[PDB]
């Protein structure tokens, strides 16, 4: 109709104005600023610990608050809490649904969140007076597969599902208090700011949206990718974040300057990225490509400074300790390796 | 463990026993026959599920000392390419189609029919990169409604390039051959086609024979004799 056409034209000219305003402040590039920093030496990482015991297919891992424990999820309905120092299995939790895609570890070391492809997210209490691990609360209400789940506080949680929706839950009540909508494609990843005040999410339509926890609705949108979004994570500072997609390209974004900082891609790699993580200083970036090995990048110069080629299958999950003593890499063939 | 303290050997023992528990539990998951069921919803998926039986729906049933685990994923209503790789090692695929829906037209578009949707979805599933060596069984249900619909209304509407006797047998043979024509491998993947009405006595036997053949082939390939 005439109203629809005029409103579409108005939306297009707002988009043009936004693009012009964004391009107006594009005066310099990060590479030019950081072209004087001396480059880091060859980062040689060796497998200090090899964690085995999964007889099935691994999907997700998460490091602990004390940088000693971690949790992993496999396809045989197993959630294993390990001990990275002495290579011991602290806990083994059966899962009602064997189709798990993500897992979350509480920052207080008291709860663990598991869910995926079942529209239900379960919370298990690690510190139980009975001495075992049992389900505490089940969150339901989504109409799509849950892709990521992370803990805000000891009582708050945020989950993104396959029905293009994010939801903020309360374990005490079990009902949603905030719903985040606006994505046309399915949501695949989310990340939280260090201050637990804002969080970003990525969608299959090559778009990332920033959402505010307090107000509960989106602030900013970033585009530029050409395929599905796979992984996302903030910079340790908390004013920037990096996103890795399926089109064999990673990008670095910014919160104040709404432009592109750097792009990480190589000619010899024609396959996308599955997991992206940072280090303590933000100088080192870890990108787990699906070409049977991981990669290490210089975040300030977009240069490769190490290859973690030690896996015989595709790479799915990757994590970094809180104090950055060592890194951990899971894989698609039921093996975990701690590199240092 | 000479260096291990009094409270460190117990942790090692606990880890070893958890290893034993998981090793014991992982041997009971390889003795199940996994079937993944697919269709168009209105093609007769629910009636087939109710017939062969005594997010995602999981069903378990036993027949002739064999355990079958059926996965129905028609209620997901999401992107297929983002989670299909989870079903990489399914033992067999079951596909459901109603051949009496050739005259029926989809509600979204009156021009498009359900038969073409079924054919294109079968084409998409058959040529997947994760199902290069996966056996597929094809079920054509509600043949009665098709046979009484083939007389009042000819099938030339669905197939304008068809020239036959306008009988049930010729139309069924043409549809069955067209459905088999969607194969592009013909070496490691075989399609089994069956016809059944609401009342049935042999579908379970058909799927049992198919899975038995698949198991025999897998066992032959495992030892390297194949």
């Amino acid at each position, epitope marked *: 109709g005439s109203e629809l056409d005029q409103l579409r034209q108005e939306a297009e000219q707002l988009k043009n104005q936004i693009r012009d305003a964004r391009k107006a402040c594009a005066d310099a590039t990060l590479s030019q600023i950081t072209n004087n920093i001396d480059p880091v030496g060859r980062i040689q990482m060796r497998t200090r610990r090899t964690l085995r015991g999964h007889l099935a297919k691994i999907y997700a891992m998460h490091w602990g608050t004390d940088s000693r424990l971690l949790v992993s999820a496999s396809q045989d309905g197993k959630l294993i809490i390990w*001990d990275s120092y002495t290579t011991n299995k602290v806990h083994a939790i059966p899962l009602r649904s064997s189709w798990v895609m993500t897992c979350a570890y509480a920052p207080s070391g008291n709860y663990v969140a598991c869910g995926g492809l079942d529209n239900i997210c379960s919370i298990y209490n690690l510190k139980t007076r009975e001495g075992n691990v049992r389900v505490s609360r089940e969150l339901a209400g989504h109409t799509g597969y849950l892709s990521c789940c992370r803990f805000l506080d000891d009582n708050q949680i945020v989950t993104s599902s396959g029905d293009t929706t994010c939801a903020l839950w309360d374990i005490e009540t079990g009902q949603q208090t905030t719903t985040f909508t606006g994505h046309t494609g399915d949501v695949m990843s989310l990340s939280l700011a260090p201050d637990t005040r804002l969080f970003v999410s990525g969608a299959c339509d090559a778009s990332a949206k920033l959402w505010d926890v307090r107000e509960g609705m989106c602030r900013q949108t970033f585009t530029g990718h050409e395929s599905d979004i796979n992984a996302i994570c903030f910079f340790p500072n908390g004013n920037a974040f990096a996103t890795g997609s399926d089109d064999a390209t990673c990008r670095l974004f910014d919160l104040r300057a709404d432009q592109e900082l750097m792009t990480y891609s190589h000619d010899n790699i024609i396959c996308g990225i599955t997991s992206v993580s940072f280090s303590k200083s933000g100088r080192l970036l870890l990108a787990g490509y699906d070409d049977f090995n991981c990669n290490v990048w210089d975040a300030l110069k977009a240069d490769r400074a190490g290859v973690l080629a030690g896996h015989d299958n595709r790479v799915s999950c990757l994590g970094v300790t809180d104090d950055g003593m060592a890194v951990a890499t899971g894989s698609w063939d039921s093996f975990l390796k701690i590199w240092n | 463990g000479c260096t291990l*303290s009094a409270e*460190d050997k117990a942790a090692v*023992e606990r880890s070893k026993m958890i290893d034993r528990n998981l090793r014991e539990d992982g041997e009971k998951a390889a003795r199940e026959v996994k079937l993944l069921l697919l269709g168009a919803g209105e093609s007769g998926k629910s009636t087939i599920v109710k017939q062969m039986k005594i997010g995602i729906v999981e069903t378990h049933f036993t027949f002739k000392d064999l355990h079958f685990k059926m996965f129905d994923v028609g209620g997901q209503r999401s992107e297929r390419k983002k989670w299909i790789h989870c079903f990489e090692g399914v033992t067999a695929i079951i596909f459901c189609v109603a051949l009496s829906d050739y005259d029926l037209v989809l509600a979204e578009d009156e021009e498009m029919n359900r038969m073409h949707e079924s054919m294109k979805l079968f084409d998409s599933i058959c040529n997947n990169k994760w199902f290069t060596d996966t056996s597929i069984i094809l079920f054509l249900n509600k043949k009665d409604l098709f046979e009484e619909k083939i007389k009042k209304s000819p099938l030339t509407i669905c197939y304008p390039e068809y020239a036959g006797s306008n009988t049930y047998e010729e139309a069924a043979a043409y549809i069955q051959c067209q459905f088999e024509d969607l194969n592009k491998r013909k070496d490691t993947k075989e399609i089994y086609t069956h016809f059944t009405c609401a009342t049935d006595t042999k579908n379970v036997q058909f799927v049992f024979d198919a899975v038995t053949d698949v198991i025999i082939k897998n066992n032959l390939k495992d030892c390297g004799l194949f």
Partner: single-chain antibody
Amino acid sequence: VQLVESCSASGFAFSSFGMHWVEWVAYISSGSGTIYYADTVKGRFTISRDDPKNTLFLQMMYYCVRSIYYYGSSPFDFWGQGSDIVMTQATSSVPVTPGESVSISCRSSKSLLHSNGNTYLYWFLQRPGQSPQLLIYRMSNLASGVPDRFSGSGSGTAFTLTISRLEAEDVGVYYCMQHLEYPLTFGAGTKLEL
């Protein structure tokens, strides 16, 4: 969770917990893989486990205590109802009025700091007419379900248990127990008289 004393389990998984007896008598881990006996009575008493009935038998005051061994664990959490390194405590009785700090000292003869950093000292309190309750495990962490007032600190061969604020419910008998190596040795009984 509760233990009714042989003994009986009700409200928890008995098959995932190690068991001790408190002097120490015997120790049996999960699955009975490792079983340790006391040097003084080895030969006349025997320990056996029955997981299906959740009952631990002792063929022959005696106490049976739970434990579990992993990182961040709190062994000797529940005490039920009821060569060798020597532990000594000089203090035997100290009158005190509620509202003032109290210090109790426990000595050793060697270095209790193992290479893993764990100082295996367990301070526990026994109320008059009540079963003992764990107060401090590993000499640095407080137990659960107990008041926050108690604390402890120490180094080398000297350790101390401190009470910052004292009330009328602190009357009892305090014990420091070592777990560095088997057999487990107990210190001299330190009684506090009101």
